[PDB]
Structures are given as structure tokens and as C-alpha cells.
Amino acid sequence: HYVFPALVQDGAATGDWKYVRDWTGSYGNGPVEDVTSLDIRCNKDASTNGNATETLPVKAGEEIGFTVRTNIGHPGPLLAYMAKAPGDASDFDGDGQVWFKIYEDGPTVTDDGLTWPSDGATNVNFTIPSSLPDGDYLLRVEHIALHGAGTEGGAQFYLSCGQVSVTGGGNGDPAPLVAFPGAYDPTDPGILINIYWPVPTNYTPPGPKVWSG
Ligand SMILES: *[C@@H]1O[C@H](CO)[C@@H](O)[C@H](O)[C@H]1NC(C)=O
Ligand SMILES: [Cu+2]
Numbered sequence: 001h002y003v004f005p006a007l008v009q010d011g012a013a014t015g016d017w018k019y020v021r022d023w024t025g026s027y028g029n030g031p032v033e034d035v036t037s038l039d040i041r042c043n044k045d046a047s048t049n050g051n052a053t054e055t056l057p058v059k060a061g062e063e064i065g066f067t068v069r070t071n072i073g074h075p076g077p078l079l080a081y082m083a084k085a086p087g088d089a090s091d092f093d094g095d096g097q098v099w100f101k102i103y104e105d106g107p108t109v110t111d112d113g114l115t116w117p118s119d120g121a122t123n124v125n126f127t128i129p130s131s132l133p134d135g136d137y138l139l140r141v142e143h144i145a146l147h148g149a150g151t152e153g154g155a156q157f158y159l160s161c162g163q164v165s166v167t168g169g170g171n172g173d174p175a176p177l178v179a180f181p182g183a184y185d186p187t188d189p190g191i192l193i194n195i196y197w198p199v200p201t202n203y204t205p206p207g208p209k210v211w212s213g
Contacts, residue, residue, distance in 0.1 A: 001029035002072055004141045004160035007056050008065035008123055019056040020066070020162045021046040029069065031145065031156030035184035035191065041094050042140065042161035042180075050090035055163040060132045060170060065125030066141045066160065072118040074145030074156065075195060077205040079104045080126040081140040082174070089136035089163035099140065099183065100174035100211040102126055107195075107203050114195050114203070118143055128164070131172030131213035136165050140180070144205070150194040152186050172213035183207045 003026050005016040017026075023043035032039040041047040058064055072078075080103040085092030103126045107114035118124070124141060138161045145156035183206070184191060190206035 003029055003069040004066040005069050006067045007162045013067045019054050020160050021050050021053050036181050040180045043159045047094055050163050053163055055089040055165045058164045059168040060128055061130035063125050063127050065123055068122050072121040072143050074147050075116050076144045076146040078118045079142045082137045085136040094138050097177040097179050099178050104205040113199055129213045131170035132166055134167055134169040139164055146195045155191045174211045176208045178208050
């Protein structure tokens with residue numbers, strides 16, 4: 001139970017939900033539980049637009065992060081996605097095959113079982129690929145909590161969508177492109193997984209491969 005309320009730029013948080021789409025029930029720190037739901041895109045009611053969210057100017061190559069409200073208190077992978085808006089980020093619903101992955105981490109095998117780079121984290125950061133073209137993007141941050149993921153319907157998704165306007169961009173062609181919902185299936189080997197009883201040797205975060213450019 002955590003949220004990603006604000007973007008981090010130049011080693012300072014911006015305002016809670018200023019450059020990030022606030023979502024229905026964000027107060028309760030509730031997980032998305034259905035990867036077929038519109039919720040999996042930007043969380044509940046957040047996709048339809050950002051008519052009251054701002055867009056942060058950023059550079060291709062810049063490290064943009066998110067604050068974490070309390071901390072990442074569940075085990076699992078961190079993932080980030082972006083999507084080019086056809087105009088202003090605040091008018092973009094993020095529909096269609098427009099999402100590409102820019103980041104994902106995976107676990108370490110210990111004596112005690114899997115540890116994760118996200119465990120206890122109070123902030124998270126990513127790097128806008130240096131070749132990403134000029135444009136308005138959604139920046140979708142996701143932690144997939146896997147502590148109850150042994151049964152179908154048991155993986156938890158903790159998400160937010162930030163709005164950024166990218167300059168200093170190159171001639172990258174982000175791909176492959178996927179949809180939320182649609183990228184994830186509840187039987188996916190990174191979503192339906194017993195992280196404990198046989199200790200995973202080769203855990204595979206779901207969705208498409210990372211676009212590096
Ligand atoms: C996140 O921040 C750490 C600490 O400065 C850094 O080592 C790492 O390269 C950064 N990761 C990304 C994805 O920008
Ligand atoms: Cu929780």
C-alpha cells in the first residue's frame with residue numbers, strides 16, 4: 001500500500017499530484033488487481049485526461065523520478081513506461097498501442113529468498129532515453145507486488161502517470177508498442193508466480209522488452 005504522487009527533477013520533489021494524474025481512491029493506497037481494467041493504464045479514472053494536471057519540461061537523457069508515499073513495502077519489480085501524446089499530455093487518454101517500456105529491474109537470490117532493488121524505497125528514478133523524440137509523453141511508473149501472486153488475481157499493481165514535455169530529443173523509434181490494458185495477461189510468468197516455495201531462478205518482469213534506443 002503505497003502511491004507515486006509527484007515527479008522528482010534536479011534532486012527536488014515537485015508538488016504532490018501537480019505533474020502526476022491523481023486517481024479515485026489514492027488516499028487509500030489501494031492496488032489495481034485486474035490487468036484487464038482501464039485502471040492498469042494510469043489508475044482509477046486517471047486515464048481519461050489530465051485537465052487538472054501539469055506537464056513538466058524535461059530533456060531526452062534526463063533522470064526523472066517519482067516520490068513514494070511511505071515506501072515500497074511489498075516485494076516485486078519496478079517498471080516504467082512512456083507514450084507519445086499526439087498534442088498536449090493533458091488531452092492524451094493513453095489509448096491504443098502507444099506504450100513502450102523504458103525501465104525494469106529484477107530480483108536477487110539470497111539465503112532468505114528473493115530481495116528486490118525496490119524494497120523499502122522512498123523514491124524511484126528513471127532516465128528518459130537520450131534518443132527519444134521531442135513531444136508530450138505520459139510517464140507510467142509501476143511496482144508489481146508479488147507476495148500474494150501465487151494465485152490468479154493475486155499480483156498487485158501500484159501505478160501513476162506523470163506528464164512531461166521532452167526537448168533536446170534524437171531520432172529514436174520507441175518499440176515495441178503495447179496497450180494498457182492488453183500488455184499484461186493474468187497467467188504471465190512475471191504476474192502469476194510463487195516467489196517463495198520454489199525460489200525463482202530466472203524471474204521475468206511481464207510486458208514487452210525495454211526500449212533503450
Ligand atoms: C537512479 O539514481 C541512482 C543514484 O544516483 C543512479 O545510480 C541510477 O543510475 C539512476 N537510475 C536511472 C534509471 O536513471
Ligand atoms: Cu499493500
